[PDB]
Design a protein around this ligand. Sequence first.
Ligand SMILES: N[C@@H](Cc1ccccc1)C(=O)NCCOCCOCCNC(=O)c1ccc(S(N)(=O)=O)cc1
Ligand SMILES: [Hg+2]
Ligand SMILES: [Zn+2]
Length: 256
Amino acid sequence: HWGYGKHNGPEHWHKDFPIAKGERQSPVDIDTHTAKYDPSLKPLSVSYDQATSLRILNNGHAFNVEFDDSQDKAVLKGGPLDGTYRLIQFHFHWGSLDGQGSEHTVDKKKYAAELHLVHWNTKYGDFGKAVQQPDGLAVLGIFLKVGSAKPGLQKVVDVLDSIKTKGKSADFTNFDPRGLLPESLDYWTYPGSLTTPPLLECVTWIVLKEPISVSSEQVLKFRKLNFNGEGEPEELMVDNWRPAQPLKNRQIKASF
Ligand SMILES: N[C@@H](Cc1ccccc1)C(=O)NCCOCCOCCNC(=O)c1ccc(S(N)(=O)=O)cc1
Ligand SMILES: [Hg+2]
Ligand SMILES: [Zn+2]
């Protein structure tokens, strides 16, 4: 099926997922000179104090940290959003090299990784129904650059040994996501999609201006993961990102 290889790679998604060439994909290049300062845009409201992490899973394209979204425990509001969005999972996109990995680019500049915190609009009742709405999901995008280690990310890094192959999961409780946030909540927002099939166009993207720094040895551990399941040929989990798509008249608004 779909992957990042030269045969099932992004250039091919359109064949099974026609929406691949739609009007509101995901990711895009953020042209900061053409982005519109919108003063009407409110400050983002992140309440992750009550977050309930459960587990970490290698799903064959990335590793996901799942959160209990049975109640308004970890939410997102404000910004360009109306209503409350619940956090369900976070995952990353990284590269083979430090000079690539992020999905979204800023003035053509690519970061070494990209953190996506996924939220769904509670008014729709479940994740499943939210993916059928144009205002269904809200993803908080965070760039990672190589520098100094991120204390808050180490617990994740250390468990990676346990879920090296596809389909493996490990208990992952009491993980506090507040540790992955930059200092500033300045952002860019635009109407987009999911960056992996089924590439559904129900995402409001919120890309933070300020990048978090992680160390070289932190990113290195991401790179030791496998796309494959146990007892199969080893294919290192690298370059699990989608190239920038055409903006097509959409406008990118800045909160700053
Ligand atoms: N019920 C079917 C259709 C149907 C109906 C009747 C009979 C057969 C089929 C249906 O519509 N299923 C829709 C499923 O929608 C779920 C979307 O996929 C789930 C996993 N993908 C994600 O959750 C996901 C989340 C975030 C990102 S990202 N990268 O942009 O941050 C990328 C992906
Ligand atoms: Hg949708
Ligand atoms: Zn993602």
